[PDB]
């Protein structure tokens, strides 16, 4: 049972690494896209 406890803790840890990696990548892409959209809108409001 103790070996089972250690193995399960390791498995939960590596699952959390995987999930955190996808969350960080998604948030970075989303922030870059929103900043580009804002800059383009500012340029259009300049030209009008």
């Amino acid at each position: 049972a103790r070996y089972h406890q250690a193995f399960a803790d390791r498995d939960q840890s590596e699952r959390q690494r995987h999930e955190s990696q996808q969350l960080a990548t998604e948030t970075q892409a989303l922030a870059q896209r929103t900043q580009q959209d804002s800059t383009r809108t500012v340029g259009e409001r300049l030209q009008d």
Partner: protein
Amino acid sequence: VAQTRLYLRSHRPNMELCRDAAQFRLLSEVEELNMSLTALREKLLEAE
């Protein structure tokens, strides 16, 4: 970045200040970054 952009756009004089699509994009950017920040904090707590 978005906070400073809103503060600088707030200084428009007399009639020129307007409810713009740029204003809508900036507000959406601010709230979306806030949501991403909250999720990233809860992931930091789970990692600890």
